Design a binder for this molecule. Sequence first.
Ligand SMILES: NC(=O)c1ccc[n+]([C@@H]2O[C@H](COP(=O)([O-])OP(=O)(O)OC[C@H]3O[C@@H](n4cnc5c(N)ncnc54)[C@H](O)[C@@H]3O)[C@@H](O)[C@H]2O)c1
Length: 470
Amino acid sequence: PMDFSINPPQRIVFVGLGTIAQSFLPLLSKVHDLSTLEIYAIDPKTPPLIEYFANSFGLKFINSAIDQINYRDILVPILGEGTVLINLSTDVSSLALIELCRSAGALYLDTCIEPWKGGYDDPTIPLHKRTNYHLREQMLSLKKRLGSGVTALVAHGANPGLVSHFVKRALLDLAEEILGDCKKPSNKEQWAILSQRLGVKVIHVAEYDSQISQKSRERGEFVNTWSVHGFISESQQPAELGWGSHERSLPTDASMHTDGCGAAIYIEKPGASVRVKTWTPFNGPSLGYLVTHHEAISIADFLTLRTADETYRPTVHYAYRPSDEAILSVHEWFGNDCMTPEKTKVLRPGDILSGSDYLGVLLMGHEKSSYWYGSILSIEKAKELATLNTATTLQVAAGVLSGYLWILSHPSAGIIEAEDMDHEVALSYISQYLGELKGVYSDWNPTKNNPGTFSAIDSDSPWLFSNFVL
Ligand SMILES: NC(=O)c1ccc[n+]([C@@H]2O[C@H](COP(=O)([O-])OP(=O)(O)OC[C@H]3O[C@@H](n4cnc5c(N)ncnc54)[C@H](O)[C@@H]3O)[C@@H](O)[C@H]2O)c1
């Protein structure tokens, strides 16, 4: 059930005008006439293309930094009914803006629950209160307090965001193939009942970035297909993962949250040091980094089934195989005591020679072993679909556009996550920007090629976390 056309708002406000924000303006141009809209962008960093932006939409740019002092003064004159606040910044508290948008009655959209300046790596803050799990529980507590009201969709980019919709569709594919049941769940509980009935035990966000760089890294240069400092920051945080009801042995140097709706583990080691085996359509078995991610918790909680005596819950976490440049950069990064790099470079469309960003979810434990579903977007395809976009950026920008259109057509939903949306509508908005949406089955498991652990008669034994992590 989808709206043929969604009317534009009266005003848009971009808190932060970085890569993703710029990668998103072209996509937004096709949908809505940016000249009939008053569009603000608040960023302390003036971009080079700010002139072309002003000579196409009349972009009212504000060179300022949003902090606890001046945020309630730069925005209040700008926020109101009919305004959409799109937060694509760093160091700005999403939760702080949510409450502010509720007062002004404005719609809110972001791709990450960011705290204020320095909320991730703050030694003065206790560790267990610096995890994505804790950031999410703050959002959920604010969701309960505010309750019904103007919509605010958080953490809806590519991942977290689209991948949540991929999980739902993957479950329906498995349901049609294994169970012959074409019945769509109607609520969270029914989604969890389906995951349990199929026997889903492990879900990976298995991403493989095969994009090749035009030129080679210069000395001391950290290169990546998206934000370098955003990648280093996520790589530095402790690895987190949803812990499933099938697991037995616990990871080493690990702690756990159990006061919520499901077990959530955070390992006291950087995600860039925790390597896990996974599977992607690029070349099958792959090695990724167990990077902490929002969807690792939201997906697991979404498919958690708690009854009087039993509990069902899959293991869910990110498995990221980044570009060849980032891997080599991470290597040198460790060699320099993880100090901030001398030089940085986010690869642009002109810098990428070939390759694709395989972004999808890998569901495991069911009758057919492994099933991968997601977006396979090549760089060449992205260049023909929009400007200022790589394969990595376009998948995110598409996620932003999807959430943008949902909050306009559903502006009275309060605070919501990707799981609260209608995945069918969410993907139909932007399916054309995701290149190839395919589902691939595979008889793979982390023990198939390791004689020391291979088993074909113990059902869930091959799906234990000990078999995935190195
Ligand atoms: N869900 C996803 O798939 C996904 C993918 C990538 C990024 N993101 C998120 O989107 C957000 C933006 O990421 P990006 O890749 O474009 O990073 P970026 O660094 O290219 O852009 C972030 C921008 O925010 C600006 N900024 C920093 N402090 C600010 C302040 N106090 N006030 C206003 N602006 C400020 C910076 O100048 C920068 O231009 C991040 O929070 C990131 O976590 C989500």
